């Protein structure tokens, strides 16, 4: 083990769960709002990933309050996750560089 790598794993699992519950809850929240486009499950999972990577194109987006809530949670999950890998990569690199220098 090692904490940093253990958090990355955790964060991935978590992410995969967040952006599934995400899809489900997005559809659940968005159906009922006239004109809402984010209303079938499959494409709504693709919206989840898209959103979590902050690449948001605008083919799909939530229009209701709770959709947008779910949205916000997905975004932060996406960022937190991906940042917590970058952090974990530095931790690793920094550990190694100290060996190269004999520290």
């Amino acid at each position: 083990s090692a904490l940093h790598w253990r958090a990355a794993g955790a964060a991935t699992v978590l992410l995969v769960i967040v952006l599934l519950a995400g899809s489900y809850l997005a559809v659940l929240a968005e159906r009922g709002a006239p004109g809402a486009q984010l209303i079938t499950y499959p494409r709504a999972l693709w919206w989840s990933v898209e959103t979590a990577t902050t690449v948001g194109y605008g083919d799909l987006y939530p229009v209701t309050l709770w959709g947008r809530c779910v949205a916000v949670v997905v975004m932060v999950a996406g960022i937190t996750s991906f940042g917590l890998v970058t952090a974990a990569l530095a931790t690793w690199f920094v550990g190694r560089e100290q060996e190269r220098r004999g520290h």
Binding site: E30, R31, A33, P34, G35, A36, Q37, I39, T40
Partner: protein, 106 residues
């Protein structure tokens, strides 16, 4: 809400000819159109989904095409068992809406 427009309301064709039913959207809906069949006294019967994906259990002569706002269900060689009403349905934006329907007649 999305308005689906099936014209013409009736379609008269000679047996075997190729036939084409039209369905038009009030605004671009991609390929989120779906086709149902209703024979006299019967329940609707999913024929084609997302405009062109075929459904297992439906004659090979059934097909479909289109994208955006203009969509078409076709039958290659028509025949007696095809006499029915044909509705299209969209799942692009919420409410979910049907077409007025068109009747095939041989």
């Amino acid at each position: 809400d999305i308005l689906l427009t099936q014209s013409p309301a009736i379609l008269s064709v000679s047996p075997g000819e190729r036939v084409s039913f039209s369905c038009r959207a009030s605004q671009s809906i991609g390929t989120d159109i779906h086709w149902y069949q209703q024979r006299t006294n019967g329940s609707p019967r999913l024929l084609i989904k997302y405009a062109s994906e075929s459904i297992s259990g439906i004659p090979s002569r059934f097909s479909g095409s289109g994208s955006g706002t203009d969509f078409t269900l076709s039958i290659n060689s028509v025949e007696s068992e095809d006499i029915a009403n044909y509705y299209c349905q969209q799942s692009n934006r919420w409410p979910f809406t049907f077409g007025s329907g068109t009747k095939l007649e041989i």
